[PDB]
Design a protein around this ligand. Structure first.
Ligand SMILES: NC(=O)OC[C@@H]1N=C(N)N2CCC(O)(O)[C@@]23N=C(N)N[C@@H]13
Length: 799
């Protein structure tokens, strides 16, 4: 028996909330409505633990994630992407979950695709549909009428471009499932360029051979986009560059559609004379820009004089102010209390097409139905937020999910529009607990919000902020900063992924990453400034960069078998054991190579000890089977214990250690380099699955030059064989082992960027093609999504 306290900012919001408390029965969750006078007071009440959840505009998210609020987005409306997999099955499940009779339930085939014809059973209407479930225009037919004959529209645009290129020289490379890869290489002419979601080239990305290709960003095609627009009456005659001195009405000071997009556009067009933040308030500059306005939540009295709320409620971020919100701003414009209204496109209807039109930032006027051509930018959906501590997220999610299933009236009310949520909300879905303001808004929008609130960091060109993942790293990096003479500074994160996030947020400058994190790091636009170099035998390239290198100290992944103690080859591996499921030398390389060949599900349908592999899968018992050396078959040493008992995939080094006597335990003491070999050959000969790229110190592109030079100078000072190495060592520490770099690192070598693909330019084509399929869509995550450019379209109808 739990309760969820929703915070209402107005009397109408409390009325709708009490309507829900009366009419919506959710088992084991009681809805309680706490009343405040404004958005900010509700944010504070949630921060104080007096309320649990509220709905915020996207423009309010960033300031919500900071003091004195410290709120986090938890529940948001999902958008339709061209990367949605198995969409028909999920839509059918969701429809079946709704406790109502007669609603449309999508009809799916045996494979999970949409049936080309979709029918609403209770009404008898039928229509046609493409591979994403979008209705073909005009194909809706009622009962008792000849139905539209429906074709399968399953072939993506890219694969069709392929097969209109191999019949009778541009052949485009595509991601698995027929999406365009963001980077295109012309195999004949050697040119490379970048493309958006539908494969049309973006301007200024084409590069000749030998030259360095442009950085290609991942794109996602998204449907139903809402926009920030300036709405005006057709009777007026002013244009956008004549906004100064006019009367205006806004949805809110903290909303994107009401304020932030407008200010960004005014700054870009140089219409708004204003310094930077912390020198002038944006609100003071806007108060000097407009004569008299209604901007709810504003603290300048002229930006509030046109507001219509009664005293104590005037200009508040609350529906108690009649001019608050998108519909409130439209009301102000209609009642001639302002000359222009700044609001979301969702408040536009064709009823207003007679009197109203849209003011475009290019100094033209257009009708309301041109809002996709006449806007101040896209406005992402609002979100339900709670405390960052996330104590009540489960209860809130359960309540909203059950209320949506039981058809409770969350997204409409007789009392008014946009009360507790946006009325345009179709559904609310749960977000990953990883999602914060940064992940929700995305890198670009996050930096825009950061700059707009005066938090933007201008990095130093002579100092490098190194990110640490634990307290020992922080201590060693503190020693390094104390001896660096202002060249090195220290930041703290929980894990390497947090360090990548901090670098993206402008809170840190560089971090060392192992291979696992490199895919995400390169997807988000980071680059390797330097790389760990482990060749103990040469040391040539360390003191002098470019004393050319023959071996980087890279580990080489192979499978270790016997000189005819056993009879194994690659073709009959079916029917050994592996170090771990997470290890890259082993598991990742062999599994990727196995299931890139064939097709299969190797999880059991291949071999006859791989710790972390469920329990007792057909292996995992030849060793219980935990991802630690507390079982004797974990790691390189335990995987070598796998090959001597129950004999039948490891780095090459694993033989050279323990062979010849170096590890004595009884089993590995009397073993020799002649008794064990590798399949592709003698144990030292290259008979390898693939080479593993070295760990990379990554940073932003603009910071590459500064990071490399500062690291080079510091390396000349400290580390292995340094002028003042007696003061500090880079690759060793009394605080711990392998802290900021692997202790066996010979040095750091500046990454030489080749005129190839950055993914191949780091991983190497064998590793890239084997592990990630040479595709930018091999893995998806919240971070990769936050670094993906959302591109809008009236529909996905490009099939
Ligand atoms: N093992 C090794 O040290 O390779 C040499 C060095 N390091 C990489 N990780 N690379 C990635 C791929 C590559 O092209 O071989 C190379 N790419 C550049 N820019 N320099 C090379």
């Amino acid at each position: 028996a739990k309760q969820v306290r929703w915070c209402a900012i107005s009397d109408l919001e409390q009325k709708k909330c009490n309507d829900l408390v009366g009419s919506c029965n959710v088992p084991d969750i009681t809805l309680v409505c706490v009343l405040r006078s404004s958005t900010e007071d509700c944010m504070t009440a949630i921060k104080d633990g007096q309320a649990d959840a509220m709905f915020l505009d996207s423009g309010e998210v960033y300031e919500a994630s900071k003091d004195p609020y410290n709120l986090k987005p938890i529940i948001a409306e999902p958008y339709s992407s061209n990367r949605d997999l198995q969409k028909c099955l999920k839509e059918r499940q969701q429809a079946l979950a709704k406790k109502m009779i007669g609603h449309y339930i999508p009809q799916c085939d045996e494979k999970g695709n949409y049936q080309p014809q979709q029918c609403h059973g209770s009404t008898g209407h039928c229509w046609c549909v493409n591979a994403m479930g979008e209705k073909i225009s005009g194909t809706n037919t009622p009962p008792g009428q000849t139905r539209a004959t429906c074709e399968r529209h399953e072939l993506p645009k890219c694969l069709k471009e392929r097969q209109v290129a191999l019949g009778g020289r541009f052949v485009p490379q595509c991601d698995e499932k027929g999406n365009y890869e963001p980077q295109q290489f012309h195999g004949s002419t050697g040119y490379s360029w970048c493309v958006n979601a539908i494969g049309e080239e973006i301007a200024g990305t084409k590069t000749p051979p030998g030259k360095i290709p442009a950085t290609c960003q991942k794109h996602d095609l998204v449907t139903t986009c809402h926009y920030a627009v300036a709405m005006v009456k057709k009777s007026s005659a002013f244009q956008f560059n004549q906004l100064k001195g006019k009367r205006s009405c806004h949805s809110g000071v903290s909303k994107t559609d009401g304020w932030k997009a407008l200010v960004t556009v005014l700054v870009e067009k140089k219409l708004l004379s204003w310094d930077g933040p912390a020198k002038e308030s944006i609100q003071r500059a806007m108060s000097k820009f407009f004569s008299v306005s209604c901007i709810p939540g504003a603290t300048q009295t002229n930006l509030c004089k046109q507001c219509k709320g009664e005293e104590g409620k005037n200009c508040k971020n609350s529906h108690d102010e009649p001019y608050y919100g998108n519909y409130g701003a439209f009301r102000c414009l209609k009642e001639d209390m302002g000359d222009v209204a700044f609001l979301r496109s969702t408040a536009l209807s064709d009823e207003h097409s007679e009197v109203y039109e849209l003011l475009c930032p290019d100094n033209t006027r257009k009708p309301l139905n041109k809002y996709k051509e006449c806007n101040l930018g896209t406005v992402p959906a609002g979100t339900v937020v709670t405390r960052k501590i996330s104590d009540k997220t489960e209860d809130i999610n359960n309540f909203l999910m059950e209320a949506q299933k039981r058809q409770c009236k969350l997204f409409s009310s007789a009392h008014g529009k946009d009360l507790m949520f946006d009325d345009s909300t179709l559904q609310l879905a749960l977000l990953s607990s990883e999602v914060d303001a940064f992940l929700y808004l995305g890198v670009k929008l996050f930096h825009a919000m950061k700059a707009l609130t005066g938090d933007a960091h201008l990095p130093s060109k002579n100092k490098v902020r190194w990110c640490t993942i634990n307290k020992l790293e922080k201590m060693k990096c503190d020693d390094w900063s104390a001896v660096s003479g202002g060249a090195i500074a220290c930041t703290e994160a929980s894990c390497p992924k947090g360090c990548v996030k901090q670098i993206l947020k402008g809170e840190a400058d560089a971090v060392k990453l192992e291979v696992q994190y490199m895919y995400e790091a390169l997807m988000c636009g980071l680059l390797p400034a330097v790389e760990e170099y482990h060749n103990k035998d040469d040391f040539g390239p360390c003191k002098t960069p470019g004393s050319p290198y023959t071996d980087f100290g890279t580990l080489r992944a192979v499978a270790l078998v016997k000189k005819s103690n056993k009879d194994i080859n690659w073709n009959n591996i079916k029917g050994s054991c592996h170090t771990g499921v997470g290890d890259i030398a082993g598991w990742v390389i062999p599994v990727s190579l196995i299931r890139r060949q064939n097709d299969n599900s190797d999880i059991d349908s291949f071999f006859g000890c791989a710790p972390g592999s469920d329990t007792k899968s057909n292996l995992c018992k030849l060793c219980k089977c935990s991802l630690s050396d507390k079982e004797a078959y974990y790691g390189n040493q335990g995987a070598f214990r796998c090959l001597v008992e129950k004999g039948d995939f490891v780095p090459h080094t694993v033989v050279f250690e323990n062979t010849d006597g170096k590890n004595p335990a009884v089993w590995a003491k009397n073993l020799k380099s002649e008794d064990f070999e590798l399949l592709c050959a003698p144990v030292s000969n290259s008979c390898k699955l693939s080479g593993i790229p070295p760990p990379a110190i990554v940073t932003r592109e603009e910071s590459i030059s500064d990071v490399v030079r500062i690291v080079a100078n510091q390396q000349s000072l400290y580390g292995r064989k340094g002028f003042e190495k007696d003061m500090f060592q880079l690759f060793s520490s009394n605080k711990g082992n392998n802290l900021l770099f692997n202790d066996n690192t010979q040095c750091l070598i500046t990454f030489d960027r080749q005129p190839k693909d950055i993914m191949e330019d780091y991983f190497g084509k064998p590793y890239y093609t084997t592990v990630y399929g040479a595709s930018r869509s091999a893995m998806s995550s919240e971070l990769i999504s936050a670094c993906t450019i959302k591109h809008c379209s009236n529909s996905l109808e490009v099939l």
